[PDB]
Amino acid sequence: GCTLSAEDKAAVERSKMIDRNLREDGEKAAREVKLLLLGAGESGKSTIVKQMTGIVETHFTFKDLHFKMFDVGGQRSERKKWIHCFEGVTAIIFCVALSDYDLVLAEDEEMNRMHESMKLFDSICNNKWFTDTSIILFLNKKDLFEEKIKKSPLTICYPEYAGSNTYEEAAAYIQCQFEDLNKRKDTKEIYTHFTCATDTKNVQFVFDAVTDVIIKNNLKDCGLF
Amino acid sequence: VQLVESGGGLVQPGGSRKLSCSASGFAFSSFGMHWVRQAPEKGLEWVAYISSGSGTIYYADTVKGRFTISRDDPKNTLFLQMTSLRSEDTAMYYCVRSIYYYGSSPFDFWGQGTTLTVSDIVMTQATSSVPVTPGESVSISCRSSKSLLHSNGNTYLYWFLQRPGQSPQLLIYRMSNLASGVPDRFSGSGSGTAFTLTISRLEAEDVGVYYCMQHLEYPLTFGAGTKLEL
Amino acid sequence: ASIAQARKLVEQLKMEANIDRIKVSKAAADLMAYCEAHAKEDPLLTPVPASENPFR
Amino acid sequence: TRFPFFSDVKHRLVLAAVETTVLVLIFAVSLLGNVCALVLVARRRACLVLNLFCADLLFISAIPLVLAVRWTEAWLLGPVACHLLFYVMTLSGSVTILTLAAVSLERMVCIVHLQGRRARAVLLALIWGYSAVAALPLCVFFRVVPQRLPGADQEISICTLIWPTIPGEISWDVSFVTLNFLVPGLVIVISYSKILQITKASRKRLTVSLAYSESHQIRVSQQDFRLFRTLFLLMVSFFIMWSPIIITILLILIQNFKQDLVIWPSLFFWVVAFTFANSALNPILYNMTL
Amino acid sequence: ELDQLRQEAEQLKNQIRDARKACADATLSQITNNIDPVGRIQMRTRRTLRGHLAKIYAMHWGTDSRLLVSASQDGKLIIWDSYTTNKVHAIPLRSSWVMTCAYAPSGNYVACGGLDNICSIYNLKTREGNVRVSRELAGHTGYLSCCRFLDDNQIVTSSGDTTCALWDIETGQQTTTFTGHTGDVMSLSLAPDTRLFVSGACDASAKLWDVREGMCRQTFTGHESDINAICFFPNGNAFATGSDDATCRLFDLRADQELMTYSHDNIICGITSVSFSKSGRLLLAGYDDFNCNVWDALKADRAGVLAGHDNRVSCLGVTDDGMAVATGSWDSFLKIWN
Ligand SMILES: CCCCCCCC/C=C\CCCCCCCC(=O)O
Helix, strand or coil, rough: CCCCCCHHHHHHHHHHHHHHHHHHHHHCCCCCEEEEEEECCCCCCHHHHHHCCCCCEEEEEEEEEEEEEECCCCCCCCCCCCHHHCCCCCCEEEEEECCCCCCCCCCCCEEECCCHHHHHHHHHCCCCCCCCCCEEEEECHHHHHHCCCCCCHHHHHHCCCCCCCCHHHHHHHHHHHHHHCCCCCCCEEEEEEEEECCCHHHHHHHHHHHHHHHHHHHHHHHHCC | CEEEEEEEEEEEECCCCEEEEEECCCCCHHHHHEEEEEECCCCCCEEEECCCCCCCCCCCCCCCEEEEEEEEECCCEEEEEECCHHHHHHHEEEEEEECCCCCCCCCCCCCCEEEECCCCEEEEEECCCEEECCCCEEEEEEECCCCCEEECEEEEEEEEEEEECCCCEEEEEEECCEEHHHHHCCEEECCEHHHHHHHCCCCHHHCCCEEEECCCCCCCCEECCCCEEE | CHHHHHHHHHHHHHHHCCCCCCCHHHHHHHHHHHHHHCHHCCCCCCCCCCCCCCCC | CCCCCCCCCCCHHHHHHHHHHHHHHHHHHHHHHHHHHHHHHHHHHHHHHHHHHHHHHHHHCCCCHHHHHHHHHCCCCCCCCCCCCCCHHHHHHHHHHHHHHHHHHHHHHHHHHHCCCHHHHHHHHHHHHHHHHHCCCHHHCCCECCCCCCCCCCCCCEEECCCCCCCHHHHHHHHHHHHHHHHHHHHHHHHHHHHHHHHHHHHHHHHHHCCCCCCCCHHHHHHHHHHHHHHHHHHHHHHHHHHHHHHHHHHHHHHHCCCCCCCCCHHHHHHHHHHHHHHCCCCHHHCCCC | CHHHHHHHHHHHHHHHHHHHHHHHCHHHCCCCCCCCCCCCCCEEEEEEEEECCCCEEEEEEEECCCCEEEEECCCCCECCCCCCCEEEEEEECCCCEEEEEEEECCEEEEEECCCCEEEEEEEEECCCCCCCEEEEECCCCCCCCEEEECCCCCEEEEEEECEEEEEECCCCEEEEEEEECCCCCCEEEECCCEEEEEEECCEEEEEEEEEECCEEEEEEECCCCCCCEEEEEECCCCCEEEEECCEEEEHHHHHHHHEEEEEECCCCCCEEEEEEECCCEEEEEECCCCCCCEEEEECCCCEEECCCCCCCCCEEEEEECCCCCHHHHHCCEEEEEE
């Protein structure tokens, strides 16, 4: 500083301290896992939040790893104007209920709720903002599905289904449909888990999926994958 | 916003003494701090400066090698360690907060002062005292040995007022800008090496000694001070 | 309340269908006049000399 | 009894006609690939790999002079080129190997910590610094002596490597190969084995949890194979490409007390050319965009 | 009843179309065809502002034409000197999902907002030396898309609940609600006299509101997609809009018509921001193709291109003195042009 006055030099020093604080806050921010929570109505998102208006942000720590979970279900506005704000999240956690196969929406009594769930799922999978964002799919309320599957066949929602009206086959069929909604197989990974309101391993499952996603991201960045 | 100095008293010549200042009610760590002392001759002398990040420290050439200025942010405390005290160090020591950014007011709040007793750009104010009556306008002049107008367009002149029994208070910053809380009766003007402070109407609370200061380069220097006497 | 909304639209069109309008050529001439009158004051249309440009 | 480095009496002018082609092809291909690879990263930007390309280019700077000294039986190049020609390639080789080891270390650490500049600015200095304190005997101990090489009948000026003291030669060679060749190889092996172990541990974790449909296991297998192949190639290429010169150096060292003519004067040219060929593989093994 | 009202509404749309058509005696292109063209507008990057670590969404100039405020998704609202590139303030936000920011014309306050449906107003001039929250205005049920200060200690905001609001900051309550849009309200622009304002929405329409009465004065249509940006012409008698169909349009308030369309054949990206120069002869527009275009507002020709951003340009502003243009984009840099 040879052409600056004393006050200009002090202002430049203030700017450098602001820079130093911004860099520190950036370094702390980069170590947190950002998860975007998506689900249809009555999809068990409340239980998923419990186990781990505007936007709602939930913070937690597991195995010394910090997670930041963002619930956007309270917004009632065009997604395409604000969904791009979530480009760069570590993963999208998508909640689908297994008891909705024979239920219809209150708005349209002729529209199956699970087909709307698949429409949201494939709107999110094949977007242009989430081409490399992994999805952790939670199929909730499995304990309420194995008891009612015997009375309501999959043919109510899936007329082309051929097989047994049991949990073992129906769960795999639904998992296959949801995973096959994806088109970018080689870039996007879907991790499917079958859980319930009394389950406790959801946190470990999310931890494992996030660890794998971070490993793959680091391998891709370091030119090894 | 409060600054409390402590640690004063009588010191034997050649001894050592620490003065301290406790800050409360403001973000201490975001401000740089000055030590400015007033001798019994009632002139203001700038002693030391330490920046907000403690990376920049300046001393007056009379105290270099003997005084050390330091901070402790978590206690909001400013320290001054004085060694080899001389008879010329007897003074009222004031702690001053100062913040620097575009449009800021760098000498807004002064402390109360602690008494210590021991057993360059020249600012000229040719008039030592002006006889005044309430209700009349007054003009105080200050002249610098060097032009204070910098190439960036700013002129670094400050006007302060010290009332009897009180600490100095900032009135004008950078020649023409009125400090917060000061009534609009005060106005600053000038160019180059000539500066003028005008008061449209005096009240009972405008009595005291007015000082002019330059902040173009360190060390910071004060004027002799012009007194207004009823 | 669909009838209420229809009435709101009808009255908003009441406050739209009965307003004064001018010719497009007159508005274009007014824009031309404003652009020409202030042309010498626009530092982007007429580059300011470097000695007065605050950014280099 | 003093091995000539780059002089041969030489079946006539055909061997020169092919040695003047292979080296120029290596030079052109390595330079083009490295420069292109370097600039490819200039718009994709890591920081160490750039140094790898720079070291490869400074290494392949050598080819024209080694082929020039080979085009004749003597040097006719000067006692100062003999002090630089070999220290411009030993330095570059050491830098390349240490940069490879540093890249492996940083990749392994990045994978392990599941995610700076200062460290890099120092890593580069140490890498270049150690490749100028260890190659120092390579710039002071060469002399252009006429050894009266057998098969010329005249004294022929060859820039040989006089070694005044045997204990100094043995101690330096033992330290040079160990700290330049062996340690980076061990670092690379450990780093890539650890990366494979981390990947396999994660894949085992996501298999017990039953989080993979039958149809995706194929992709998982395909992905782990590709990862496995890439790392295996990166591990084995370092030893396959760099070992011949280390073996050659140890053989020349043991060639003083050993009297079995363990190495041919011509052989050291082909070994060094083979090493030059490594700069046509480095820009494609460590930059895989396919 | 319902049918009667709908039929009456249709006749009113017919008469408005007929009233507008009767006033279209000539086009603007038939009047400005004989004006000497602006030529070629060359601009160069003078300042680059570094320090945001995420996408920059909003930017606003101060009325001194020297201080900037910018908002990013890293949770930071930064105030810039922009002559020396020094940072003056860095305000951390309670919610990092910020989409809009504004600078008070007095320079004492800044405002911000986003996906938290709350407009936060900060006091820049305090005795403690730091910047603190002065107000949090809540009452919108959607994301806050744009906010602008008025000189009467009042603020106008627009949100994704399809409404606009005039807020009294000191009380912290809404004083006026502007309803009438049928889609998300994306942009606002205040008139130079701060007595009318315009809002552009996702129903492919813009509306002129009287900020003192709360009623809609007139509605402008013509865009084929959502309107992302809107700006007033300097004299207050016209405004320009930018939409997702890669077209800019100039509208006249007194003629109640569209005057000129700004488009070209190789531009297929949406428009994110629009602004006018001091004289109004140049129209500047930011696009999703990472570039910015300068159009001749009267001849509808492309007068220049601003390039150098590596991602979508999200915000654009011109100083009150007309000396410089500031652009911000998703690569986390701000640039100043002359
Ligand atoms: C790690 C080594 C990389 C060096 C690559 C360049 C190849 C070196 C070629 C000639 C250098 C001289 C080789 C012999 C040196 C040792 C001589 C000895 O004492 O036996």
